[PDB]
């Protein structure tokens, strides 16, 4: 039985659910531990909705500390997905929103109490949200075997998620248990020859340079929607908070390694030197006499956007020795508004990494089209909400401003966000 979160689906246009955030004893990777969970599980339940559904999610805070919930990737109003809300211990809050028309893909939910994200997310508070689309009914997709792979690492101390050290605040915290759906090196015994894998990097800081032995991956969706047609890749880098959806065509019986290949993201300090080995994430067993489906020739059209009216430059910097991080020379201040834009305009954001470490840049509320990174034209058209920048790279993003209100942009190495790498955008 392949480990995968339980699914809660909308019905009759509504997903109404109470989720408790609570310390939960679990058995994990052959040991006993108490994690912080939504819905009593790690990961939390997958919420599956359709465009136009209403979601009404009551978060009950049964932690000893305040918390809140963020709907990562969902283009909903910041008046609902409010990064400044704090739910005190013992209290509840109801999030209510409508799923946008034409939205599709894998999204996720996690805590977002500013300055206090990294320990909550590391402790196990996360889960996926899938938006089903009409495109999922085409033969080439409908007949695939679908799985969600939540890629999230963990370290334990004293049977609880390990506390943050000073080095953790600088690099972001990685764990030694590199888990898939909360399991250590599970085996997926495929029953069908085409797999549709939804991939979520819900780690604090760990990157996953994914490859499947002997199989290309056919990328069909990025963070925030479908590509226009499948893109064959040999490997796929998922930075923290990124998602993707891929098709895998099992052409031959066998036992295949899905691995996270070595990737140097510019971490510094005390660490083993000498090269890193690939980390096996899962074993994939192909069925007898597999006959895969043909690929879809087309997926969904990417919209032509208006010409942009303004260009913004956001510069990321570091003070690695203080573990403080900055956008345009300042640390986040919840009282300050850094950027002001108009609703129903398009902007170009040039995000420039002037540090030594990779930084995966994220913008709430307003999905963007990546035009280029590092001067290189992006290989597909799809909505994204996280983009990785290596040292010295500039990413050029086309940002349609939709929903009014104040929201945030930040690095999704969540320790960096907590240590200052976040700013505030107001759309009016
Ligand atoms: Cu009914
Ligand atoms: Cu997020
Ligand atoms: Cu977000
Ligand atoms: Cu960062
Ligand atoms: Cu955020």
PDB file of N, CA and C in Angstrom, residues 125-220:
ATOM      1  N   UNK A 125       3.614  20.659   9.660  1.00  0.00           N
ATOM      2  CA  UNK A 125       2.362  21.327   9.318  1.00  0.00           C
ATOM      3  C   UNK A 125       2.370  21.692   7.831  1.00  0.00           C
ATOM      4  N   UNK A 126       1.825  20.803   7.004  1.00  0.00           N
ATOM      5  CA  UNK A 126       1.683  21.095   5.582  1.00  0.00           C
ATOM      6  C   UNK A 126       0.734  20.067   4.989  1.00  0.00           C
ATOM      7  N   UNK A 127       0.184  20.386   3.819  1.00  0.00           N
ATOM      8  CA  UNK A 127      -0.600  19.447   3.069  1.00  0.00           C
ATOM      9  C   UNK A 127      -0.875  20.028   1.694  1.00  0.00           C
ATOM     10  N   UNK A 128      -1.371  19.182   0.815  1.00  0.00           N
ATOM     11  CA  UNK A 128      -1.539  19.567  -0.586  1.00  0.00           C
ATOM     12  C   UNK A 128      -2.978  19.984  -0.863  1.00  0.00           C
ATOM     13  N   UNK A 129      -3.153  20.774  -1.918  1.00  0.00           N
ATOM     14  CA  UNK A 129      -4.449  21.138  -2.449  1.00  0.00           C
ATOM     15  C   UNK A 129      -4.382  20.923  -3.953  1.00  0.00           C
ATOM     16  N   UNK A 130      -5.241  20.062  -4.465  1.00  0.00           N
ATOM     17  CA  UNK A 130      -5.279  19.805  -5.882  1.00  0.00           C
ATOM     18  C   UNK A 130      -6.524  20.440  -6.473  1.00  0.00           C
ATOM     19  N   UNK A 131      -6.327  21.142  -7.578  1.00  0.00           N
ATOM     20  CA  UNK A 131      -7.400  21.721  -8.349  1.00  0.00           C
ATOM     21  C   UNK A 131      -7.550  20.895  -9.621  1.00  0.00           C
ATOM     22  N   UNK A 132      -8.659  20.150  -9.678  1.00  0.00           N
ATOM     23  CA  UNK A 132      -8.985  19.277 -10.795  1.00  0.00           C
ATOM     24  C   UNK A 132      -9.482  20.123 -11.954  1.00  0.00           C
ATOM     25  N   UNK A 133      -9.137  19.776 -13.180  1.00  0.00           N
ATOM     26  CA  UNK A 133      -9.608  20.614 -14.270  1.00  0.00           C
ATOM     27  C   UNK A 133     -10.279  19.742 -15.314  1.00  0.00           C
ATOM     28  N   UNK A 134     -10.928  20.417 -16.264  1.00  0.00           N
ATOM     29  CA  UNK A 134     -11.593  19.670 -17.311  1.00  0.00           C
ATOM     30  C   UNK A 134     -10.557  18.941 -18.148  1.00  0.00           C
ATOM     31  N   UNK A 135      -9.330  19.473 -18.201  1.00  0.00           N
ATOM     32  CA  UNK A 135      -8.300  18.842 -18.996  1.00  0.00           C
ATOM     33  C   UNK A 135      -7.996  17.444 -18.459  1.00  0.00           C
ATOM     34  N   UNK A 136      -8.213  17.213 -17.154  1.00  0.00           N
ATOM     35  CA  UNK A 136      -7.962  15.908 -16.556  1.00  0.00           C
ATOM     36  C   UNK A 136      -8.832  14.800 -17.146  1.00  0.00           C
ATOM     37  N   UNK A 137      -9.899  15.149 -17.882  1.00  0.00           N
ATOM     38  CA  UNK A 137     -10.754  14.160 -18.523  1.00  0.00           C
ATOM     39  C   UNK A 137     -10.252  13.686 -19.889  1.00  0.00           C
ATOM     40  N   UNK A 138      -9.221  14.303 -20.475  1.00  0.00           N
ATOM     41  CA  UNK A 138      -8.764  13.796 -21.762  1.00  0.00           C
ATOM     42  C   UNK A 138      -8.231  12.378 -21.587  1.00  0.00           C
ATOM     43  N   UNK A 139      -8.322  11.542 -22.630  1.00  0.00           N
ATOM     44  CA  UNK A 139      -7.937  10.133 -22.517  1.00  0.00           C
ATOM     45  C   UNK A 139      -6.510   9.966 -21.991  1.00  0.00           C
ATOM     46  N   UNK A 140      -5.613  10.831 -22.473  1.00  0.00           N
ATOM     47  CA  UNK A 140      -4.191  10.687 -22.197  1.00  0.00           C
ATOM     48  C   UNK A 140      -3.897  10.947 -20.730  1.00  0.00           C
ATOM     49  N   UNK A 141      -4.821  11.606 -20.018  1.00  0.00           N
ATOM     50  CA  UNK A 141      -4.627  11.884 -18.603  1.00  0.00           C
ATOM     51  C   UNK A 141      -5.548  11.021 -17.752  1.00  0.00           C
ATOM     52  N   UNK A 142      -6.812  10.904 -18.149  1.00  0.00           N
ATOM     53  CA  UNK A 142      -7.836  10.210 -17.375  1.00  0.00           C
ATOM     54  C   UNK A 142      -7.452   8.756 -17.109  1.00  0.00           C
ATOM     55  N   UNK A 143      -6.735   8.124 -18.047  1.00  0.00           N
ATOM     56  CA  UNK A 143      -6.387   6.713 -17.945  1.00  0.00           C
ATOM     57  C   UNK A 143      -5.008   6.507 -17.315  1.00  0.00           C
ATOM     58  N   UNK A 144      -4.376   7.591 -16.878  1.00  0.00           N
ATOM     59  CA  UNK A 144      -3.105   7.449 -16.181  1.00  0.00           C
ATOM     60  C   UNK A 144      -3.374   7.045 -14.733  1.00  0.00           C
ATOM     61  N   UNK A 145      -2.380   6.442 -14.084  1.00  0.00           N
ATOM     62  CA  UNK A 145      -2.406   6.253 -12.632  1.00  0.00           C
ATOM     63  C   UNK A 145      -1.796   7.501 -11.978  1.00  0.00           C
ATOM     64  N   UNK A 146      -2.560   8.170 -11.119  1.00  0.00           N
ATOM     65  CA  UNK A 146      -2.162   9.424 -10.524  1.00  0.00           C
ATOM     66  C   UNK A 146      -1.670   9.207  -9.098  1.00  0.00           C
ATOM     67  N   UNK A 147      -0.547   9.851  -8.769  1.00  0.00           N
ATOM     68  CA  UNK A 147      -0.098   9.870  -7.391  1.00  0.00           C
ATOM     69  C   UNK A 147       0.428  11.259  -7.065  1.00  0.00           C
ATOM     70  N   UNK A 148       0.299  11.628  -5.810  1.00  0.00           N
ATOM     71  CA  UNK A 148       0.946  12.817  -5.265  1.00  0.00           C
ATOM     72  C   UNK A 148       2.190  12.369  -4.519  1.00  0.00           C
ATOM     73  N   UNK A 149       3.316  13.031  -4.795  1.00  0.00           N
ATOM     74  CA  UNK A 149       4.555  12.816  -4.049  1.00  0.00           C
ATOM     75  C   UNK A 149       4.923  14.114  -3.334  1.00  0.00           C
ATOM     76  N   UNK A 150       4.724  14.110  -2.013  1.00  0.00           N
ATOM     77  CA  UNK A 150       5.112  15.200  -1.148  1.00  0.00           C
ATOM     78  C   UNK A 150       6.523  14.929  -0.638  1.00  0.00           C
ATOM     79  N   UNK A 151       7.450  15.768  -1.091  1.00  0.00           N
ATOM     80  CA  UNK A 151       8.871  15.628  -0.836  1.00  0.00           C
ATOM     81  C   UNK A 151       9.195  16.517   0.352  1.00  0.00           C
ATOM     82  N   UNK A 152       9.456  15.876   1.504  1.00  0.00           N
ATOM     83  CA  UNK A 152       9.682  16.668   2.698  1.00  0.00           C
ATOM     84  C   UNK A 152      10.616  15.906   3.618  1.00  0.00           C
ATOM     85  N   UNK A 153      11.691  16.566   4.013  1.00  0.00           N
ATOM     86  CA  UNK A 153      12.699  15.986   4.884  1.00  0.00           C
ATOM     87  C   UNK A 153      12.424  16.362   6.334  1.00  0.00           C
ATOM     88  N   UNK A 154      13.098  15.670   7.234  1.00  0.00           N
ATOM     89  CA  UNK A 154      12.825  15.793   8.664  1.00  0.00           C
ATOM     90  C   UNK A 154      14.079  15.375   9.427  1.00  0.00           C
ATOM     91  N   UNK A 155      14.281  15.968  10.607  1.00  0.00           N
ATOM     92  CA  UNK A 155      15.251  15.415  11.528  1.00  0.00           C
ATOM     93  C   UNK A 155      14.566  15.382  12.872  1.00  0.00           C
ATOM     94  N   UNK A 156      14.927  14.394  13.674  1.00  0.00           N
ATOM     95  CA  UNK A 156      14.285  14.199  14.959  1.00  0.00           C
ATOM     96  C   UNK A 156      15.344  14.271  16.045  1.00  0.00           C
ATOM     97  N   UNK A 157      14.950  14.846  17.171  1.00  0.00           N
ATOM     98  CA  UNK A 157      15.751  14.865  18.381  1.00  0.00           C
ATOM     99  C   UNK A 157      14.804  14.727  19.559  1.00  0.00           C
ATOM    100  N   UNK A 158      15.072  13.754  20.426  1.00  0.00           N
ATOM    101  CA  UNK A 158      14.213  13.547  21.572  1.00  0.00           C
ATOM    102  C   UNK A 158      12.801  13.159  21.150  1.00  0.00           C
ATOM    103  N   UNK A 159      12.670  12.543  19.966  1.00  0.00           N
ATOM    104  CA  UNK A 159      11.398  12.101  19.423  1.00  0.00           C
ATOM    105  C   UNK A 159      10.505  13.230  18.901  1.00  0.00           C
ATOM    106  N   UNK A 160      11.057  14.426  18.715  1.00  0.00           N
ATOM    107  CA  UNK A 160      10.307  15.549  18.175  1.00  0.00           C
ATOM    108  C   UNK A 160      11.118  16.115  17.026  1.00  0.00           C
ATOM    109  N   UNK A 161      10.529  16.908  16.115  1.00  0.00           N
ATOM    110  CA  UNK A 161      11.347  17.554  15.095  1.00  0.00           C
ATOM    111  C   UNK A 161      12.464  18.380  15.718  1.00  0.00           C
ATOM    112  N   UNK A 162      13.676  18.208  15.173  1.00  0.00           N
ATOM    113  CA  UNK A 162      14.863  18.798  15.758  1.00  0.00           C
ATOM    114  C   UNK A 162      14.746  20.312  15.830  1.00  0.00           C
ATOM    115  N   UNK A 163      15.160  20.961  16.935  1.00  0.00           N
ATOM    116  CA  UNK A 163      15.146  22.421  17.003  1.00  0.00           C
ATOM    117  C   UNK A 163      16.118  23.043  16.014  1.00  0.00           C
ATOM    118  N   UNK A 164      15.845  24.296  15.634  1.00  0.00           N
ATOM    119  CA  UNK A 164      16.717  25.095  14.802  1.00  0.00           C
ATOM    120  C   UNK A 164      17.986  25.499  15.548  1.00  0.00           C
ATOM    121  N   UNK A 165      19.130  25.314  14.886  1.00  0.00           N
ATOM    122  CA  UNK A 165      20.428  25.792  15.354  1.00  0.00           C
ATOM    123  C   UNK A 165      20.740  27.128  14.695  1.00  0.00           C
ATOM    124  N   UNK A 166      21.796  27.831  15.139  1.00  0.00           N
ATOM    125  CA  UNK A 166      22.284  28.976  14.364  1.00  0.00           C
ATOM    126  C   UNK A 166      22.646  28.762  12.898  1.00  0.00           C
ATOM    127  N   UNK A 167      23.276  27.624  12.556  1.00  0.00           N
ATOM    128  CA  UNK A 167      23.594  27.326  11.154  1.00  0.00           C
ATOM    129  C   UNK A 167      22.337  27.132  10.322  1.00  0.00           C
ATOM    130  N   UNK A 168      21.298  26.601  10.986  1.00  0.00           N
ATOM    131  CA  UNK A 168      20.051  26.367  10.289  1.00  0.00           C
ATOM    132  C   UNK A 168      19.458  27.678   9.803  1.00  0.00           C
ATOM    133  N   UNK A 169      19.666  28.757  10.550  1.00  0.00           N
ATOM    134  CA  UNK A 169      19.052  30.038  10.213  1.00  0.00           C
ATOM    135  C   UNK A 169      19.714  30.648   9.006  1.00  0.00           C
ATOM    136  N   UNK A 170      20.997  30.322   8.821  1.00  0.00           N
ATOM    137  CA  UNK A 170      21.761  30.797   7.682  1.00  0.00           C
ATOM    138  C   UNK A 170      21.494  29.998   6.408  1.00  0.00           C
ATOM    139  N   UNK A 171      21.518  28.662   6.465  1.00  0.00           N
ATOM    140  CA  UNK A 171      21.397  27.862   5.265  1.00  0.00           C
ATOM    141  C   UNK A 171      19.949  27.410   4.997  1.00  0.00           C
ATOM    142  N   UNK A 172      19.110  27.455   6.026  1.00  0.00           N
ATOM    143  CA  UNK A 172      17.886  26.711   5.962  1.00  0.00           C
ATOM    144  C   UNK A 172      18.132  25.327   6.518  1.00  0.00           C
ATOM    145  N   UNK A 173      17.138  24.755   7.171  1.00  0.00           N
ATOM    146  CA  UNK A 173      17.318  23.496   7.852  1.00  0.00           C
ATOM    147  C   UNK A 173      16.929  22.340   6.939  1.00  0.00           C
ATOM    148  N   UNK A 174      17.862  21.410   6.791  1.00  0.00           N
ATOM    149  CA  UNK A 174      17.598  20.156   6.114  1.00  0.00           C
ATOM    150  C   UNK A 174      17.626  19.049   7.158  1.00  0.00           C
ATOM    151  N   UNK A 175      16.934  17.968   6.869  1.00  0.00           N
ATOM    152  CA  UNK A 175      16.925  16.807   7.749  1.00  0.00           C
ATOM    153  C   UNK A 175      17.598  15.616   7.091  1.00  0.00           C
ATOM    154  N   UNK A 176      17.969  14.644   7.908  1.00  0.00           N
ATOM    155  CA  UNK A 176      18.604  13.452   7.426  1.00  0.00           C
ATOM    156  C   UNK A 176      17.594  12.422   6.912  1.00  0.00           C
ATOM    157  N   UNK A 177      16.318  12.508   7.282  1.00  0.00           N
ATOM    158  CA  UNK A 177      15.275  11.611   6.813  1.00  0.00           C
ATOM    159  C   UNK A 177      14.649  12.261   5.591  1.00  0.00           C
ATOM    160  N   UNK A 178      14.917  11.728   4.411  1.00  0.00           N
ATOM    161  CA  UNK A 178      14.411  12.361   3.202  1.00  0.00           C
ATOM    162  C   UNK A 178      13.230  11.523   2.726  1.00  0.00           C
ATOM    163  N   UNK A 179      12.028  12.015   3.002  1.00  0.00           N
ATOM    164  CA  UNK A 179      10.799  11.237   3.005  1.00  0.00           C
ATOM    165  C   UNK A 179       9.935  11.596   1.791  1.00  0.00           C
ATOM    166  N   UNK A 180       9.123  10.631   1.401  1.00  0.00           N
ATOM    167  CA  UNK A 180       8.112  10.791   0.378  1.00  0.00           C
ATOM    168  C   UNK A 180       6.776  10.447   1.036  1.00  0.00           C
ATOM    169  N   UNK A 181       5.860  11.419   1.126  1.00  0.00           N
ATOM    170  CA  UNK A 181       4.557  11.229   1.751  1.00  0.00           C
ATOM    171  C   UNK A 181       4.727  10.762   3.191  1.00  0.00           C
ATOM    172  N   UNK A 182       5.808  11.215   3.826  1.00  0.00           N
ATOM    173  CA  UNK A 182       6.089  10.917   5.214  1.00  0.00           C
ATOM    174  C   UNK A 182       6.688   9.530   5.435  1.00  0.00           C
ATOM    175  N   UNK A 183       7.067   8.835   4.367  1.00  0.00           N
ATOM    176  CA  UNK A 183       7.628   7.490   4.400  1.00  0.00           C
ATOM    177  C   UNK A 183       9.059   7.495   3.896  1.00  0.00           C
ATOM    178  N   UNK A 184       9.862   6.575   4.430  1.00  0.00           N
ATOM    179  CA  UNK A 184      11.263   6.462   4.049  1.00  0.00           C
ATOM    180  C   UNK A 184      11.409   5.415   2.945  1.00  0.00           C
ATOM    181  N   UNK A 185      11.776   5.864   1.736  1.00  0.00           N
ATOM    182  CA  UNK A 185      12.077   4.980   0.617  1.00  0.00           C
ATOM    183  C   UNK A 185      10.978   3.934   0.413  1.00  0.00           C
ATOM    184  N   UNK A 186       9.735   4.391   0.221  1.00  0.00           N
ATOM    185  CA  UNK A 186       8.646   3.492  -0.144  1.00  0.00           C
ATOM    186  C   UNK A 186       8.820   2.897  -1.538  1.00  0.00           C
ATOM    187  N   UNK A 187       8.016   1.870  -1.819  1.00  0.00           N
ATOM    188  CA  UNK A 187       7.955   1.250  -3.115  1.00  0.00           C
ATOM    189  C   UNK A 187       6.572   1.505  -3.691  1.00  0.00           C
ATOM    190  N   UNK A 188       6.542   2.035  -4.902  1.00  0.00           N
ATOM    191  CA  UNK A 188       5.328   2.229  -5.652  1.00  0.00           C
ATOM    192  C   UNK A 188       5.254   1.120  -6.675  1.00  0.00           C
ATOM    193  N   UNK A 189       4.286   0.226  -6.491  1.00  0.00           N
ATOM    194  CA  UNK A 189       4.057  -0.823  -7.472  1.00  0.00           C
ATOM    195  C   UNK A 189       2.991  -0.343  -8.438  1.00  0.00           C
ATOM    196  N   UNK A 190       3.402   0.122  -9.611  1.00  0.00           N
ATOM    197  CA  UNK A 190       2.475   0.694 -10.555  1.00  0.00           C
ATOM    198  C   UNK A 190       1.558  -0.391 -11.105  1.00  0.00           C
ATOM    199  N   UNK A 191       0.274  -0.063 -11.266  1.00  0.00           N
ATOM    200  CA  UNK A 191      -0.648  -0.982 -11.939  1.00  0.00           C
ATOM    201  C   UNK A 191      -0.939  -0.580 -13.379  1.00  0.00           C
ATOM    202  N   UNK A 192      -0.669   0.668 -13.737  1.00  0.00           N
ATOM    203  CA  UNK A 192      -0.855   1.133 -15.089  1.00  0.00           C
ATOM    204  C   UNK A 192       0.475   1.608 -15.636  1.00  0.00           C
ATOM    205  N   UNK A 193       0.553   1.718 -16.956  1.00  0.00           N
ATOM    206  CA  UNK A 193       1.818   1.966 -17.590  1.00  0.00           C
ATOM    207  C   UNK A 193       2.086   3.449 -17.771  1.00  0.00           C
ATOM    208  N   UNK A 194       1.087   4.308 -17.672  1.00  0.00           N
ATOM    209  CA  UNK A 194       1.350   5.747 -17.655  1.00  0.00           C
ATOM    210  C   UNK A 194       1.064   6.231 -16.242  1.00  0.00           C
ATOM    211  N   UNK A 195       2.015   6.961 -15.660  1.00  0.00           N
ATOM    212  CA  UNK A 195       1.844   7.551 -14.339  1.00  0.00           C
ATOM    213  C   UNK A 195       1.740   9.060 -14.511  1.00  0.00           C
ATOM    214  N   UNK A 196       0.861   9.667 -13.725  1.00  0.00           N
ATOM    215  CA  UNK A 196       0.786  11.111 -13.630  1.00  0.00           C
ATOM    216  C   UNK A 196       1.211  11.448 -12.203  1.00  0.00           C
ATOM    217  N   UNK A 197       2.387  12.065 -12.053  1.00  0.00           N
ATOM    218  CA  UNK A 197       2.909  12.291 -10.708  1.00  0.00           C
ATOM    219  C   UNK A 197       2.842  13.787 -10.442  1.00  0.00           C
ATOM    220  N   UNK A 198       2.136  14.151  -9.381  1.00  0.00           N
ATOM    221  CA  UNK A 198       2.109  15.499  -8.845  1.00  0.00           C
ATOM    222  C   UNK A 198       3.212  15.594  -7.805  1.00  0.00           C
ATOM    223  N   UNK A 199       4.120  16.563  -7.968  1.00  0.00           N
ATOM    224  CA  UNK A 199       5.334  16.653  -7.162  1.00  0.00           C
ATOM    225  C   UNK A 199       5.270  17.963  -6.390  1.00  0.00           C
ATOM    226  N   UNK A 200       5.513  17.870  -5.079  1.00  0.00           N
ATOM    227  CA  UNK A 200       5.485  19.015  -4.221  1.00  0.00           C
ATOM    228  C   UNK A 200       6.737  18.988  -3.371  1.00  0.00           C
ATOM    229  N   UNK A 201       7.520  20.067  -3.423  1.00  0.00           N
ATOM    230  CA  UNK A 201       8.613  20.246  -2.489  1.00  0.00           C
ATOM    231  C   UNK A 201       8.089  21.050  -1.318  1.00  0.00           C
ATOM    232  N   UNK A 202       7.784  20.349  -0.224  1.00  0.00           N
ATOM    233  CA  UNK A 202       7.306  21.018   0.965  1.00  0.00           C
ATOM    234  C   UNK A 202       8.380  21.121   2.030  1.00  0.00           C
ATOM    235  N   UNK A 203       9.648  21.021   1.622  1.00  0.00           N
ATOM    236  CA  UNK A 203      10.750  21.077   2.572  1.00  0.00           C
ATOM    237  C   UNK A 203      11.003  22.543   2.938  1.00  0.00           C
ATOM    238  N   UNK A 204      11.585  22.769   4.095  1.00  0.00           N
ATOM    239  CA  UNK A 204      12.047  24.090   4.476  1.00  0.00           C
ATOM    240  C   UNK A 204      13.067  24.667   3.504  1.00  0.00           C
ATOM    241  N   UNK A 205      14.031  23.847   3.071  1.00  0.00           N
ATOM    242  CA  UNK A 205      15.273  24.331   2.474  1.00  0.00           C
ATOM    243  C   UNK A 205      15.846  23.350   1.442  1.00  0.00           C
ATOM    244  N   UNK A 206      15.589  22.047   1.589  1.00  0.00           N
ATOM    245  CA  UNK A 206      16.172  21.038   0.718  1.00  0.00           C
ATOM    246  C   UNK A 206      15.649  21.208  -0.702  1.00  0.00           C
ATOM    247  N   UNK A 207      16.571  21.097  -1.665  1.00  0.00           N
ATOM    248  CA  UNK A 207      16.255  21.043  -3.085  1.00  0.00           C
ATOM    249  C   UNK A 207      16.232  19.591  -3.532  1.00  0.00           C
ATOM    250  N   UNK A 208      15.448  19.295  -4.547  1.00  0.00           N
ATOM    251  CA  UNK A 208      15.376  17.947  -5.094  1.00  0.00           C
ATOM    252  C   UNK A 208      15.639  18.013  -6.595  1.00  0.00           C
ATOM    253  N   UNK A 209      16.834  17.585  -6.975  1.00  0.00           N
ATOM    254  CA  UNK A 209      17.181  17.484  -8.387  1.00  0.00           C
ATOM    255  C   UNK A 209      16.722  16.097  -8.866  1.00  0.00           C
ATOM    256  N   UNK A 210      15.461  15.988  -9.280  1.00  0.00           N
ATOM    257  CA  UNK A 210      14.824  14.702  -9.492  1.00  0.00           C
ATOM    258  C   UNK A 210      15.198  14.067 -10.818  1.00  0.00           C
ATOM    259  N   UNK A 211      15.399  12.751 -10.736  1.00  0.00           N
ATOM    260  CA  UNK A 211      15.542  11.940 -11.921  1.00  0.00           C
ATOM    261  C   UNK A 211      14.977  10.563 -11.607  1.00  0.00           C
ATOM    262  N   UNK A 212      14.395   9.995 -12.650  1.00  0.00           N
ATOM    263  CA  UNK A 212      13.888   8.635 -12.629  1.00  0.00           C
ATOM    264  C   UNK A 212      14.736   7.786 -13.551  1.00  0.00           C
ATOM    265  N   UNK A 213      15.332   6.763 -12.967  1.00  0.00           N
ATOM    266  CA  UNK A 213      16.203   5.864 -13.721  1.00  0.00           C
ATOM    267  C   UNK A 213      15.524   5.376 -14.988  1.00  0.00           C
ATOM    268  N   UNK A 214      16.212   5.525 -16.114  1.00  0.00           N
ATOM    269  CA  UNK A 214      15.799   5.001 -17.408  1.00  0.00           C
ATOM    270  C   UNK A 214      14.526   5.616 -17.987  1.00  0.00           C
ATOM    271  N   UNK A 215      14.043   6.754 -17.449  1.00  0.00           N
ATOM    272  CA  UNK A 215      12.802   7.342 -17.897  1.00  0.00           C
ATOM    273  C   UNK A 215      12.998   8.844 -18.019  1.00  0.00           C
ATOM    274  N   UNK A 216      12.636   9.419 -19.173  1.00  0.00           N
ATOM    275  CA  UNK A 216      12.410  10.854 -19.247  1.00  0.00           C
ATOM    276  C   UNK A 216      11.177  11.183 -18.406  1.00  0.00           C
ATOM    277  N   UNK A 217      11.091  12.434 -17.993  1.00  0.00           N
ATOM    278  CA  UNK A 217       9.892  12.964 -17.366  1.00  0.00           C
ATOM    279  C   UNK A 217       9.275  13.883 -18.406  1.00  0.00           C
ATOM    280  N   UNK A 218       7.964  13.814 -18.572  1.00  0.00           N
ATOM    281  CA  UNK A 218       7.249  14.682 -19.483  1.00  0.00           C
ATOM    282  C   UNK A 218       6.506  15.693 -18.624  1.00  0.00           C
ATOM    283  N   UNK A 219       7.078  16.883 -18.526  1.00  0.00           N
ATOM    284  CA  UNK A 219       6.507  17.916 -17.706  1.00  0.00           C
ATOM    285  C   UNK A 219       5.214  18.414 -18.326  1.00  0.00           C
ATOM    286  N   UNK A 220       4.139  18.400 -17.546  1.00  0.00           N
ATOM    287  CA  UNK A 220       2.839  18.866 -18.000  1.00  0.00           C
ATOM    288  C   UNK A 220       2.292  20.039 -17.225  1.00  0.00           C
TER     289      UNK A 220
END
